[PDB]
Amino acid sequence: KIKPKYAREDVVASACKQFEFRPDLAATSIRTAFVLAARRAGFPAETVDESCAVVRGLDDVAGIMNYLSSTYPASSTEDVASLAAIAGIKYLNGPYEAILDQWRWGRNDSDTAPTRNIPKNPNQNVFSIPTILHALGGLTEAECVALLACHSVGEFHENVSGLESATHTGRRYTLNNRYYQFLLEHERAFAPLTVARTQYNKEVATLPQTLRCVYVKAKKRQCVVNAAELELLKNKTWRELVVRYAADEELWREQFQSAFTKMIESNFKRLRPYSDPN
Numbered sequence: 001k002i003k004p005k006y007a008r009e010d011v012v013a014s015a016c017k018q019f020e021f022r023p024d025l026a027a028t029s030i031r032t033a034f035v036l037a038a039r040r041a042g043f044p045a046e047t048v049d050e051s052c053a054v055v056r057g058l059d060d061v062a063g064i065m066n067y068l069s070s071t072y073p074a075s076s077t078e079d080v081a082s083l084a085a086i087a088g089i090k091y092l093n094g095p096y097e098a099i100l101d102q103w104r105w106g107r108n109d110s111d112t113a114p115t116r117n118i119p120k121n122p123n124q125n126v127f128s129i130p131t132i133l134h135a136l137g138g139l140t141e142a143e144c145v146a147l148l149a150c151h152s153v154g155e156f157h158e159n160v161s162g163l164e165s166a167t168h169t170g171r172r173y174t175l176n177n178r179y180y181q182f183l184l185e186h187e188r189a190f191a192p193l194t195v196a197r198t199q200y201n202k203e204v205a206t207l208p209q210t211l212r213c214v215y216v217k218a219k220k221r222q223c224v225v226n227a228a229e230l231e232l233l234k235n236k237t238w239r240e241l242v243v244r245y246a247a248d249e250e251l252w253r254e255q256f257q258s259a260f261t262k263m264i265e266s267n268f269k270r271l272r273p274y275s276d277p278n
Ligand code: HEM
Pocket: 024, 027, 028, 029, 030, 031, 033, 034, 048, 049, 050, 051, 052, 053, 057, 129, 132, 133, 147, 148, 150, 151, 153, 154, 155, 156, 157, 158, 160, 161, 162, 163, 226, 228, 229, 263
């Protein structure tokens, strides 16, 4: 039955309206697509030292998801969640047109036991970034690198990373290739950041130790990036992709949409090609 009950653009439009009153939840909804995919792949995170696939800071997003599901019953919650992430990209002026046009449906709301992969080294606790990203549907290195431009939007939260009033790149509301340009520009100025225990970050059981920081200007904005994200700039092939995306927005948009689609389809079976229900 090539028969979704609803039009995918209606769900996207309904999520966008929510974002119009809660603009901050667009980027969190995008992060949620990664959280879900990382969890299906066996990489749920406990610490942002590994990735932002932590379960924390998603209450308000779950609020919107519940609204969308009530609004669109008969849809699976997983399908709705992927469309909300896509709506986040749209809201944040990101490239989403191919992702939406090629969107497939039928994601099973399975009741699957959470799994956590175990590193080969007994004294290793965090997985590398390539290990995690490649596993989100079998991504190429180009797709992995393309996906990280989601860090060009959103911000840090006290119950997730343990700090507030910081972003990756100094901006929050445009999802483009500025991420790559930012990393390359400030690569050598990033310094270790100590995240202190405060009365506001108690939800973060173990504060991250690998965060690094630059202050960018007539006031300074605190810009924060994982040491691991920066260390990849030392890898030849990774860096050439960062350099390339910094200069070639068109190429980046293509790879981004291809990666994002693989991610939101990863570890789902029997997804169905979309047909207009009308
Ligand atoms: C795999 C390595 C990754 C690392 C180390 C990492 C690190 C982080 C950190 C520290 C934050 C701040 C979280 C907070 O305090 O709220 C963040 C936020 C965010 N990340 Fe990641 N991340 C990774 C992967 C990804 C991927 C693959 C995506 C998208 C597909 C993504 C999308 C986002 C978005 C949209 C935000 C902002 C969320 C918000 O504003 O609520 N990240 N990331």
